[PDB]
Design a protein around this ligand. Structure first.
Ligand SMILES: C[C@H](CCC(=O)NCCC[N+](C)(C)C[C@H](O)CS(=O)(=O)O)[C@H]1CC[C@H]2[C@@H]3[C@H](O)C[C@@H]4C[C@H](O)CC[C@]4(C)[C@H]3C[C@H](O)[C@]12C
Ligand SMILES: [Mg+2]
Ligand SMILES: [Zn+2]
Ligand SMILES: [Zn+2]
Lengths: 1336, 50, 476
DNA sequence: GCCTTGACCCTCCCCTAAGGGGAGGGTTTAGATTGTGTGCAGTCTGACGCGGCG
DNA sequence: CGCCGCGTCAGACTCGTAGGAATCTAAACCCTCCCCTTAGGGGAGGGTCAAGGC
């Protein structure tokens, strides 16, 4: 049909060619006989007939006369549907500026004219004149005149010059300007400029003028002289049920425009005084502005409610505009809704659908099969049969729903498992019966939740429901490869109770012929489910081939584990059930079944697990009583002891031994300790207090307490909640967040009193208000992520890149937060993985690291694997299937046509409602030590002194992999020789946290340089030290001289010889900053390593990381590598000069010195190391360290937020969003290219342009990749439709109109807007043969 | 509540809102993303157009 | 200076409106005198052209036999009963005839000026005076447009010097005596237009009638018309000073209409139009103040524009007034009874029948916005509940298609002639149905035979062999 | 059976005599009057563009 | 010319039923145009009913 959408400015002739007549009157319809009035806003002569195939006068009344325009009424005899398509126009009596091109910032009229919006608005409002042309006059072009200046220069310099006011003046200025001449003038002005602010000004204006030259647009079309009128059926005036009329606000706004325009024409006919005509022109301008965008300029016009009228711009923008309410999502037919209940009998692929719902949802199918089977002669006979609900329409309904899936949806659809397809089973209720195992995917409970049903109509939709969306395809999560159709609550409690063992249970110690004998003995009441017993078990294993070989042996098992073995599929080991099965063990059992045997055994296994767990949770009788909340018998004395401690601390505070701060902190500490004591006593009295007799002798076993069994199986409940049931509730926080110093010593088994309950509600309401207010923030973040990543699709199979990220385990301090195996599983290697035994290929170059390769990496010592990433994919407009890796929902490599961007955005945004809206080194374990980035010297006391700020300590095991990683401050003295064994708890590093020491260069003697005493020093004596110290104070502390001039502590030999560096002849001196305390004099020897001077020192976070927000005061990084020097101080901006050795030397910054610097004048810096400290800005990380550094930073900083709440997301999904944030590139040197310098282009565009330029031997452009947040990256897309539908619709449509953009509909949103197959999924083939039957 | 076909709005011709109006279910933006995350292009195209 | 500080056009208007100070009782009088002197100057400049006075005396002799009345020709005299006008018309005719023959040339400037000053006495109705001045504008603008078509062709040829093309063109007025002097320089430009020297004739020889149709010189006509322009620019600059001084009166009146459907600046602009009409119609010789007369026109314009454009569905002025009268009768009956009256008694206090008042009560209601929040929410609006009632149900479309198929089936089971006249008698798969005579003439057969054929075919289709498919498309 | 023929028959639209009734439109109206008139708001946080100081 | 505080702009969950908003306001003239009134008459356009003629 069409292949692109173009947007541009409309000329007056274009606007008159859309129209079918001029709207000349504000009449809508006759009040007596509601036919539309001629020449009005509803006019059948302009806009089309109001009855289908009938004129207005009734003279031509049938399709016999079609297309004939009546000569009496002028109405064309045609369909009335044309009243939705036929526009009109208003010929404006005065030129009126378009408010979008004036007032949507930056102003296009202002930027094109290079006038301030203050001067343009003064001319528009008839307050000032502007000189269109100066002539033989001293007046420059566009010079603004007040009225008196105009009347002076008019009589003084005659009518040689031309000066006007109003939008006729602005229009004459926009018409009189030469765009190409001004482009050349501005370009040669750019070639004369070094000021980067003015250079940005000029490149903005140049690309505006160039967009106007390249487009067909003319500047003067930004001033309206003709006004389009929307078709009247899109602004309908319709009679309501009670005879009242309902209208659009556009009729009010259009009527006001017509009324002020007709009065302006009248006044120009009467030759009114010009104060009246200027007023009418201002009123027509503000009426047209209110029609186009109501509320931008001035106060919003309200009509008859004091509610502002909805303008044309409000129709298409916002959450309730066309795009977001009607185009990006719709209300659909063949859709129902009901409360969901549980069906525990259902199979995983089926739902229960009420017969009353299905009879309506499937109604044309039933009509078709009633007429087809001869049971109805006519669709109306069939309709009456279905109304009467004859007994045969239920048979017809049972055969029309037979293999026909339905989609079930629960809002909010946070991820794609919120829509799943099921085969319906017709039930008799009114409630949908949902399978239990899918509820966790839906986040559904049966406490009043509703779900929507949708009927797939076409064969393709039915086969996508069956093949893509069916719940038996959805057992693995797409966020992480973990099972998402997983047992819970009742199932895991039944499977846990079944697989537990009692000590002296009935039937203990017999020997069973198999699991069938165990079931016989349990059912006949001769053995207990927990009787530990000896069963002959035959288990099958897969050999090297796909063959399944059996082994039979007597296992020491229980009766219930033998019973549970009967439902386990064959390729699985008996050790998978020979344990008590909690939630984790059952999830791992399902994952094991999936990886070993595949999907068909796994869905059968999951159904059998559900049935068995339900059955044996029923058999258990597992109740909850009040005697199950066993309160520890020593809780009262723990509380009495903490009360005695708090009383003695209170008496200490009365006796002045402690101030209120440490007093309060001591009370908080002795109550947190007593709470931990009560919790440990409660859990110890709860977890094993089955004491049981084995042949007379008492023995302890794990407890069959019901509260404990629910908590221990992972069914429901944490230890933190058993603490509130049976322990004490503990310390509560004020709404301030500060802890109330008297805790709830009660639990819920005992009562809380009124005061305890009140201070518990303090935090209960805070949590509930967080839940209520963070869904909006998480939805907004997910929407921004989808709209930044929607266009990313796996388009290629392999891009042949060799880049990638080096995956290592995440180690923060001395904990391994993320192992290598789950950071590298399902990813394609980027280089051959080698053993510690060198040059032997362990894993070849393009291997997808499935579980066997990961076990091979784990049994070897591989600590780092370089893998392929989407940020390093070479594919233009997409991603190859190898840089992505596995589809985590399938378990194999991703397919071409997968919308991995929507999956990534949903995977990140789904857990957002589980996030919150509001010194020395102690090595843990044994292993070798190695340090990195060390500036190391030997102290006089047998030490290692690491005088650096980039060093880090790493603890290696005998395996060879780093297990702990710390990093130590400047001048941290090492208690260890680096490179050999340490022990657990062994202190390796000690330093000063609160003060920064100065550590010397080489051994020698103190010498002084530029420290003129009395002006750079206060020599102060500390009364109990014996030797006085010398302070180098602030700059305002002393007079001119040493305040800015730096004291330099030289080191020389005692014979006066300056000591020279090993390797360089660099002069050994130490320049120290102000606020320093020195304890040294001249003459005393100092070896290398003496410390001479001491200078003393949730969900919003993820949203800030993806928006790439620069923090409040960032870290300061070294742009270029070199040596530090200092320029103009004593302004407030300390001037740092990094001096390279082989580059262009001067590079300065303006560091405000109210942040402590962490660099010295003698030490070098690498590009990007911290000069000052603070939260790093990701733009700086990208510029100075690169793309891999900023993606490493963003994935680590986002997974720190997610791992803290126990949320497991693959970092494929964060790398997808990071790749979509690195989509632009600013050109630094164009070469022989079509780009300017300092111009932001797409990275793929400049990469393709360089591919073509180095294909023709010429030099391509050089660029610097930008980092944009997810809002600025999704607003900077090459598609104006998706950007305008995301947000800021006015800005997007304004820049797209003045630039003359064209949208080729290449992403998912633009094909959703326009009702096409998306270019992903099963529409990927269609778009491929749409583009190869267009490029041919 | 269920609906196969029914009344439609005036300006946009989409189904009406509630079960009092015998209306359709809102297949909103997040459901469209859910269908785009599957490859359900034909299911989506019939939700949007037909 | 307050320039550039506000966005409100009301504040901008009031700001620029207050820079004109109010007039005294004496200021209105001499502004009105300036207006009347401008119009008197226009009239005394009109008097130089005779055919206007001839038309006016034509009008008077038409008043003599009463083809019209002089109450529509003159509003009065200054130094209306029909006896004084006889005296003044006779003395003016005796002046026009005594001027007609005296043509010489210095003597011709005595009688024209005394006729001008004696024609000054007639203060005409605006219609006749406007007709005379517009007639003179048409005469001078057609004379002027051929005057500059003379130069239109001279630009059509070549480069155009007309700095000294005007040297002896002034005064000759009969022939090309000025035209021959242009080639007398023999510069190349003086070539071009001269070979068009014949084509120019019917322009400056159409002067051959008009200088015999006006009697006076070209610049005499042009300069009495430029004196008319000076007089009307004096009268127009004085009307502008009376409108600009009285805009506070318009705001003073318009503030009492502020919430009846129109906005404050809309009311101000309509009242400004009324005020300009009042300035045109005011007579200071009545001794009244300008406020007294101008309030009538300002209120007229404001109330008329409220009746015209305050409502989406426009109610005519007669029904607007019926609604207003009904509303104040309802106010009186609600006060005197403490209870909102019913249309029965509301029709007994009014003079009107009850069924008239019921529709008047149903006629006065303003449309609701379809952006009205239902539930006073902001997510669901009134437009979300309004249904397209012109849509055909898909079961009705499918029934229509099945019925087309069934009638196609039964019409295939008839003779070709009978099925043709039965598809032609009705509009089946044609764009129009036909009458018996049209079907007959297409067959070259009578009307009654076609009636017989179609009645027989219908009787065939009535049989249950051919009817059970179609009987299913009927209801109770 | 096909085809005319003369006589009938139907509805629908316009006409009657002397205005009645009403709708919908114009026009003027002469004591003097000369600057509106409301709110409402317990958002925060980015982010951009600009006067104004240095 | 470069930087800092200020002005401004743009974003911020889907089912059932209730469900809106409620003030304010010429009169006397004149005109044309359209429909209406009896008790049916006249005609145009289009159908219908028995006669037969082949
Ligand atoms: C279409 C809609 C059904 C849903 C019906 C049911 C209830 C109706 C409204 C109420 O009656 C209040 C009010 C009465 C006024 O008279 C006209 C406007 C109002 C808002 C009505 C509009 C419309 O008629 C509604 C919404
Ligand atoms: Mg719930
Ligand atoms: Zn018509
Ligand atoms: Zn790739």
């Amino acid at each position: 049909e069409f292949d692109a959408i173009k947007i541009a400015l409309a000329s007056p002739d274009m606007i008159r060619s859309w129209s079918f007549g001029e709207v000349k009157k504000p009449e809508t319809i006759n009040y007596r006989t509601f036919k539309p009035e001629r020449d009005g806003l509803f006019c059948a002569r302009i806009f089309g007939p109001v009855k289908d195939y009938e004129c207005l006068c009734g003279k031509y009344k049938r399709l016999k006369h079609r297309g004939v325009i009546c000569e009496k009424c002028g109405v064309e005899v045609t369909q009335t549907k044309v009243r939705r398509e036929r526009m009109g126009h208003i010929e404006l009596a005065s030129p009126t500026a378009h408010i979008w091109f004036l007032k949507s910032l930056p102003s296009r009229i202002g930027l094109l004219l290079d006038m301030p919006l203050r001067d343009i608005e003064r001319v528009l409002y008839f307050e000032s004149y502007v000189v269109i042309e100066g002539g033989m006059t001293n007046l420059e072009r566009q010079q603004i005149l007040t009225e008196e200046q105009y009347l002076d220069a008019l009589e003084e310099f005659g009518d040689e010059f031309d000066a006007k006011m109003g939008a006729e003046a602005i229009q004459a200025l926009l018409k009189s300007m030469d765009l190409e001449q001004e482009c050349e003038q501005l370009r040669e002005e750019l070639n004369e400029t070094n000021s980067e602010t003015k250079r940005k000004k000029l490149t903005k204006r140049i690309k505006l003028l160039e967009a106007f030259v390249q487009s067909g647009n003319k500047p003067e079309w930004m001033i309206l002289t003709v006004l389009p009128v929307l078709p009247p059926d899109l602004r309908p005036l319709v009679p309501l049920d009670g005879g009242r009329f309902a209208t659009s606000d556009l009729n009010d706004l259009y009527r006001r425009v017509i009324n002020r325009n007709n009065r302006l024409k009248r006044l120009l006919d009467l030759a009114a005084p010009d104060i009246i005509v200027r007023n009418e022109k201002r009123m027509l301008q503000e009426a047209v502005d209110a029609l186009l965008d109501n509320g931008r300029r001035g106060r919003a016009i309200t009509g008859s409610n004091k509610r502002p009228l909805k303008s044309l711009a409000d129709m298409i923008k916002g959450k309730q505009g066309r795009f977001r309410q009607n185009l990006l999502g719709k209300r659909v037919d063949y859709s129902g809704r009901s409360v969901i209940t549980v069906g525990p009998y259902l199979r995983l692929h089926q739902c229960g659908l009420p017969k009353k719902m299905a009879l309506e949802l499937f109604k044309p199918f039933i009509y078709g099969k009633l007429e087809l089977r001869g049971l109805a002669t006519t669709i109306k006979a069939a309709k009456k049969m279905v109304e009467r609900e004859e007994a045969v329409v239920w048979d017809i309904l049972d055969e029309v729903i037979r293999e026909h899936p339905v989609l079930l949806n629960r809002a909010p659809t946070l991820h794609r498992l919120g829509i799943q397809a099921f085969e319906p089973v017709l039930i008799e209720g009114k409630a949908i019966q949902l399978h239990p195992l899918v509820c966790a995917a839906y986040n559904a409970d049966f406490d009043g939740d509703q779900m929507a049903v949708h009927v797939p109509l076409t064969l393709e939709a039915q086969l996508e429901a069956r093949a893509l969306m069916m719940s038996t395809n959805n057992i693995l999560s797409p966020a992480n490869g973990e099972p998402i159709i997983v047992p819970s609550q009742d199932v895991v409690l039944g499977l846990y109770y079944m697989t537990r063992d009692c000590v002296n249970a009935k039937g203990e110690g017999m020997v069973l012929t198999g699991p069938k004998e165990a079931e016989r003995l349990y059912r006949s009441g001769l053995a207990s489910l927990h009787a530990r017993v000896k069963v002959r078990i035959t288990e099958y294993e897969k050999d090297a081939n796909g063959e399944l070989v059996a082994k039979t042996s007597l296992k020491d098992t229980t009766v219930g584990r033998a019973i549970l073995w009967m439902i386990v599929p064959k390729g699985l080991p008996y050790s998978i059930v020979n344990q008590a099965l909690g939630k984790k063990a059952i999830s791992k059992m399902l994952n094991t079944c999936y990886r070993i045997l595949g999907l068909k055994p796994t869905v059968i296994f999951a159904d059998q697990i559900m049935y068995t767990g339900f059955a044996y949770a029923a058999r258990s009788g597992a109740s909850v009583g009040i005697d199950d909340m066993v309160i520890p018998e020593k809780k009262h004395e723990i509380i009495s002891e903490a009360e005695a401690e708090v009383a003695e601390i209170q008496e200490q505070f009365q006796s002045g031994l402690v101030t209120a701060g440490e007093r309060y902190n001591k009370v908080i500490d002795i109550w947190a300790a007593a709470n931990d004591r009560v919790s440990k006593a409660m859990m110890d009295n709860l977890q094993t207090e089955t004491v049981i007799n084995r042949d007379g002798q008492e023995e302890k076993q794990v407890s069959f307490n019901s509260i404990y069994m629910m908590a221990d199986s992972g069914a429901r409940g944490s230890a933190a909640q058993i603490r509130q049931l049976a322990g004490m509730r503990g310390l509560m926080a004020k709404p301030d967040g500060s802890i109330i110093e008297t805790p709830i010593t009660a639990n819920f088994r005992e009562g809380l009193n009124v005061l305890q309950y009140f201070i518990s509600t303090h935090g209960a309401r805070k949590g509930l208000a967080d839940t209520a207010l963070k869904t909006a923030n998480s939805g907004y973040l997910t929407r921004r992520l989808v709209d930044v990543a929607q266009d990313l699709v796996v388009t290629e199979d392999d891009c042949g890149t060799h880049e990638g990220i080096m995956m290592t385990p995440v180690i923060e301090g001395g904990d391994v937060k993320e192992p290598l195996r789950d950071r590298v599983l399902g990813r394609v290697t980027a280089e051959d993985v080698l053993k510690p035994g060198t040059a032997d290929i362990l894993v070849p170059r393009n291997t997808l690291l499935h579980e066997q390769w990961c076990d091979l990496l784990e049994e070897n010592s591989v600590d780092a694997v370089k893998v392929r990433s989407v940020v390093s994919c070479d594919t233009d407009f997409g991603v190859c299937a190898h840089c992505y890796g596995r589809d985590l929902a399938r378990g194999h490599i991703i397919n071409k046509g997968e919308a991995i961007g929507v999956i990534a955005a949903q995977s990140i945004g789904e857990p957002g409602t589980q996030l919150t809206m509001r010194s020395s080194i102690q090595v843990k374990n044994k292993g070798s030590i190695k340090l990195s980035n060390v500036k190391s010297v030997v102290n006089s006391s047998g030490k290692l002194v690491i005088t650096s700020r980039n060093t880090e300590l790493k603890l290696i095991d005998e395996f060879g992999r780093t297990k702990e990683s710390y990093k130590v401050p400047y001048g941290a003295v090492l208690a260890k020789g680096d490179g050999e064994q340490v022990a657990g708890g062994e202190t390796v590093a000690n330093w000063d946290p609160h003060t920064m020491p100065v550590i010397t260069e080489v051994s020698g003697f103190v010498r002084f340089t530029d420290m003129i005493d009395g002006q750079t020093i206060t020599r102060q004596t500390d009364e109990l030290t014996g030797l006085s110290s010398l302070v180098v104070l602030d700059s305002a502390e002393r007079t001119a001289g040493g305040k800015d001039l730096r004291p330099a502590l030289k080191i020389v030999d005692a014979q006066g010889n300056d000591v020279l560096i090993p390797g360089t002849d660099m002069p050994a001196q130490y320049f120290l900053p102000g606020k320093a305390i020195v304890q040294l004099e001249d003459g005393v020897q100092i070896s290398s390593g003496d410390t001479l001077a001491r200078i003393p020192q949730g969900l919003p976070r993820v949203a800030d990381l993806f928006e790439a927000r620069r923090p409040k005061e960032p870290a300061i990084l070294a742009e270029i590598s070199g040596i530090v020097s200092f320029g103009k101080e004593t302004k407030g901006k300390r001037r740092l000069v990094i001096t390279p050795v082989d580059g262009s030397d001067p590079y300065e910054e303006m560091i405000p010195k109210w942040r402590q610097l962490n660099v010295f004048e003698g030490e070098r810096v690498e590009r990007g190391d911290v000069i000052s400290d603070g939260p790093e800005a990701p733009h700086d990380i990208l510029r100075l360290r690169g793309v891999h550094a900023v993606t490493r930073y963003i994935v680590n900083e986002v997974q720190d937020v997610y791992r803290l709440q126990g949320v497991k997301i693959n970092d494929k999904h964060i790398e997808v969003i990071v790749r979509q944030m690195l989509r632009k590139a600013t050109i630094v040197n164009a070469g022989s290219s079509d780009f300017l310098e300092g111009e932001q282009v797409e990275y793929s565009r400049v990469k393709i342009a360089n591919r073509e330029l180095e294909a023709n031997g010429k030099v391509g452009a050089t660029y610097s990749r930008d980092l944009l947040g997810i809002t600025k990256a999704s607003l900077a897309t090459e598609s104006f439709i998706s950007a305008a539908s995301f947000q800021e619709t006015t800005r997007v449509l304004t820049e797209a109109a003045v630039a003359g953009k064209r949208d080729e509909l290449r992403g998912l949103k633009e094909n959703v807007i326009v009702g096409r197959l998306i270019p992903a999924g099963t529409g990927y083939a269609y778009h491929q043969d749409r583009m190869r039957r267009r490029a041919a | 509540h269920a609906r196969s076909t029914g009344s439609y709005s005036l300006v946009t011709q989409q189904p009406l809102g509630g079960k009092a109006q015998f209306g359709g279910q809102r297949f909103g933006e997040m459901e469209v993303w859910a269908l785009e995350a599957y490859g359900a292009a034909y299911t989506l195209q019939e939700m949007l157009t037909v | 200076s307050e320039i550039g500080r506000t966005t409100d056009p009301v504040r901008m208007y009031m700001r620029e409106m207050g820079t004109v100070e109010l007039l005294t009782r004496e200021g209105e009088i001499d502004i009105a005198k300036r207006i009347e002197d401008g119009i008197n100057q226009v009239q005394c400049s009109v008097a130089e052209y005779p055919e206007a006075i001839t038309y006016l005396l034509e009008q008077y002799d038409r008043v003599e036999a009463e083809e019209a009345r002089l109450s529509d020709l003159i509003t009065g005299f200054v130094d209306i009963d029909p006896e004084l006008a006889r005296e003044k018309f006779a003395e003016l005719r005796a002046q026009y005839v005594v001027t007609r023959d005296t043509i010489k040339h210095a003597t011709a400037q005595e009688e024209i000026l005394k006729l001008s000053e004696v024609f000054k006495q007639f203060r005409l109705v605006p219609k006749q005076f406007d007709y005379l001045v517009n007639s003179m504008r048409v005469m001078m603008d057609r004379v002027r447009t051929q005057e500059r078509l003379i130069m239109k062709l001279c630009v059509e040829q070549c480069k155009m010097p007309k700095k000294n093309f005007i040297t002896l063109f002034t005064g000759n007025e009969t022939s090309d005596t000025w035209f021959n002097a242009a080639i007398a320089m023999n510069k190349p430009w003086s070539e071009k237009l001269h070979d068009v020297s014949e084509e120019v004739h019917r322009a400056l020889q159409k002067l051959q009638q008009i200088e015999e149709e006006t009697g006076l010189t070209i610049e005499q006509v042009k300069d009495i018309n430029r004196r008319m322009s000076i007089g009307e620019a004096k009268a127009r600059r004085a009307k502008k000073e009376m409108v600009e001084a009285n805009l506070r009166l318009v705001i003073s009146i318009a503030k009492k209409y502020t919430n009846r459907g129109l906005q404050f600046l809309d009311l101000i602009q309509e009242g400004n139009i009324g005020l300009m009409k009042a300035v045109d119609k005011f007579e200071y010789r009545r001794g009244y103040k300008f406020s007294t007369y101008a309030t009538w026109w300002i209120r007229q314009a404001i109330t008329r524009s409220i009746a015209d454009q305050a409502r989406t569905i426009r109610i005519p002025v007669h029904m607007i007034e019926t609604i207003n009268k009904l509303n104040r009768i309802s106010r009186q009956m609600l006060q005197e009874m403490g209870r909102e009256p019913t249309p029965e008694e509301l029709a007994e206090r009014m003079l009107m029948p009850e069924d008239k008042i019921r529709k008047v009560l149903k006629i006065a209601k303003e449309p609701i916005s379809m952006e009205t929040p239902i539930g006073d929410d902001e997510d669901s609006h009134l437009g979300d509940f309004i249904e397209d009632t012109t849509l055909e149900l898909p079961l009705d479309s499918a029934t229509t298609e099945s019925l087309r198929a069934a009638t196609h089936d039964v019409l295939a089971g008839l003779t070709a002639r009978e099925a043709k006249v039965l598809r032609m008698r009705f509009g089946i798969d044609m764009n129009t149905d036909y009458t018996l005579e049209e079907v007959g003439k297409q067959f070259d057969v009578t009307r009654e035979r076609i009636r017989q054929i179609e009645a027989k075919a219908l009787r065939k289709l009535r049989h249950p062999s051919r009817s059970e498919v179609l009987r299913s498309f009927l209801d109770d």
